[PDB]
């Protein structure tokens, strides 16, 4: 006998069915489902429990899918891809509720607003950070940068948009000012992903310099906003936009890694305590199940791994 | 003892070398010369493994039958636990395991009838600066007309049997003159 | 608490359990080629998947130019491998 920690059927699961290189994956906030996609363009939905069967698959994308996030109420999935389009999928219907189309170059990264009106922040290789609204064809805000943007998030109040890119430094725009209120400086190479903390106080940002840097985005900080740096993961010559994600308890942080290992760090000490093998290629995305200590990781090896951990 | 200096294996007694005497100490033949047959060895039950001969040349198979505990009659009217027939999960897990291996074999067997490798080379001379290589494998395209490449009716004697199992009989019943 | 090296791991150890190094001396008998991790007769062979197009790029740079971006996992500071004077220049 051995210790168990989740309702998974086995302490790790191997999900097979993809043929494309899986570039993104996220859980539904209700914990019932996860959705995963990448170069196959098909978005695969999986149940979290039991046989974890691939109950649904959505086509419709025709350029590979960079990033994919659920809306907070789990009514819709927002996903974006290199077809220069942001597509919002109704979870009950499995159909494209909105197809935002004003980007001029590949859209790589997406983040829905947490509450209030449903807004979708997006960042692209045209250098624009754009916030779309479900109710209008035209976007609400377009913030233009000289250099391509490949990561985006709102803050928790959904009134500051944080975008990172080729600049390494970060264009953080405040939606009442339409100005950069501050920049976060420490990244020596491009920013492959940004994820907002559950409470919204912090963001982690992952970069091709092989570090994750934790930033305090609260309105007042008396000094430098850099809280800490995490290392151990690696970015290879593929230059992927390796993502990052928070644990819902905030005590743990994850990032994609080219060395096949699933990294977990302790937020305060920045030490590693989980280094989980099993992948055969670049782990492009990693996420925590929102209610249960299940780790999701999606890799360039065409495989999705579910596994349970002792989150302490 | 630090006024004394050892000089031969007598000087140590039954103890090992002395780390406080900074001289080259050889309490036995150990380390004097230079570094193919099993050693005589004790078992965990305190006897001595003369039977260990019978375990050379096997895959660590069940046939430890070389003591005598395993030829004398073990208990009658047994305490039923291990002696119960295994559960439904066991016959299911066993049956599924058996087919799934032979199935993958049979598909290649009727055929007989991108993908990459990451290679980490212990030879540290390496490619330039790289503790590993990553390498692309492709399969040579089989020409569908080309007839079998090689003569394969080559015949050689049967491979030697696996090393003998101990013979384990009861003592000979002598029946000499009349029978 | 530790978990030994196994063809597959069933049960997700943390990190102190898997990684913590084997204690004690190391042989003088068998030095720098022989000590390394291996599985086949010379090497650790494991399957891999990559972004074909980028892997194709890295051949062509080493062949034409003399240098490449380092394939290894955990490459550390050795990001590039080749005629480093050309890589920096």
């Amino acid at each position: 006998t051995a210790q168990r920690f989740s309702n998974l059927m086995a302490p790790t699961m191997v999900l097979l069915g993809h043929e494309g290189e899986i570039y993104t994956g996220a859980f539904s906030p209700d914990g019932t489902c996860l959705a995963t996609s990448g170069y196959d363009q098909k978005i695969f939905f999986w149940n979290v429990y039991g046989e974890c069967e691939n109950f649904s698959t959505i086509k419709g994308h025709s350029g590979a899918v960079m990033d994919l996030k659920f809306t907070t109420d789990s009514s819709s999935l927002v996903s974006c891809g290199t077809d220069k389009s942001v597509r919002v999928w109704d979870m009950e219907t499995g159909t494209c509720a909105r197809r935002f189309r004003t980007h001029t170059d590949f859209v790589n990264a997406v983040h829905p607003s947490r509450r209030g009106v449903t807004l979708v922040a997006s960042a692209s290789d045209d250098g624009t950070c754009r916030v779309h609204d479900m109710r209008t064809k035209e976007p609400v805000k377009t913030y233009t940068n000289r250099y391509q943007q490949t990561a985006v998030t709102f803050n928790d109040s959904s009134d500051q948009v944080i975008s990172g890119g080729i600049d390494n430094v970060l264009k953080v725009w405040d939606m009442r000012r339409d100005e950069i209120t501050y920049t976060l400086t420490g990244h020596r190479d491009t920013i492959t992903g940004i994820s907002l903390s559950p409470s919204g106080k912090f963001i982690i940002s992952n970069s091709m310099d092989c570090t994750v840097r934790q930033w305090d985005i609260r309105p007042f900080v008396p000094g430098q906003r850099s809280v800490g740096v995490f290392a151990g993961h690696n970015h290879n010559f593929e230059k992927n936009l390796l993502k990052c994600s928070w644990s819902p308890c905030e005590r743990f942080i994850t990032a994609g890694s080219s060395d096949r290992f699933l990294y977990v760090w302790e937020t305060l000490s920045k030490k590693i305590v989980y280094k989980l093998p099993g992948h055969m290629g670049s782990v492009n995305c990693t996420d925590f199940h929102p209610k249960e200590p299940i780790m999701l990781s999606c890799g360039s090896d065409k495989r999705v791994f579910l596994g349970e951990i002792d989150m302490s | 003892r630090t006024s004394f200096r050892p000089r031969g294996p007598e000087d140590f007694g039954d103890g090992g070398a002395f780390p406080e005497i900074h001289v080259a100490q050889f309490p036995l033949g150990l380390g004097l010369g230079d570094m193919n047959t099993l050693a005589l060895q004790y078992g965990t039950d305190g006897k001595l493994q003369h039977d260990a001969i019978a375990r050379i040349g096997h895959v660590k198979d069940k046939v430890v039958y070389s003591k005598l505990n395993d030829m004398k009659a073990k208990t009658w009217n047994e305490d039923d636990d291990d002696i119960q027939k295994p559960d439904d999960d066991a016959v299911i897990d066993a049956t599924e395991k058996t087919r799934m291996a032979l199935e993958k074999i049979v598909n290649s067997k009727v055929a007989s009838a991108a993908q990459y490798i990451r290679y980490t080379p212990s030879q540290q001379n390496g490619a330039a600066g790289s503790q590993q290589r990553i390498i692309r494998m492709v399969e040579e395209q089989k020409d569908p007309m080309e007839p079998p490449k090689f003569k394969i009716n080559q015949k050689i004697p049967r491979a030697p049997p696996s090393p003998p199992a101990p013979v384990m009989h009861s003592p000979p019943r002598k029946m000499t003159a009349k029978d | 608490i530790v978990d030994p090296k196994t063809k597959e791991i069933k049960s997700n150890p943390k990190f102190d359990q898997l990684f913590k190094p084997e204690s004690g001396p190391v042989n003088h008998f068998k030095s720098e080629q022989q000590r390394s991790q291996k599985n086949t007769l010379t090497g650790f062979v494991e399957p891999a998947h990559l972004n074909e197009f980028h892997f194709n790029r890295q051949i062509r740079s080493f062949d034409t130019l003399g240098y490449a971006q380092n394939p290894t996992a955990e490459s550390g500071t050795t990001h590039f491998v080749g005629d480093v004077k050309k890589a920096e220049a």
């Binding site: 699961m13 | - | 996992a73 955990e74």
Partner: peptide, 11 residues
């Protein structure tokens, strides 16, 4: 299907 995590090589 359920599975397990194959341990890769290290430097």
């Amino acid at each position: 299907k359920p599975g397990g995590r194959g341990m890769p090589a290290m430097p």
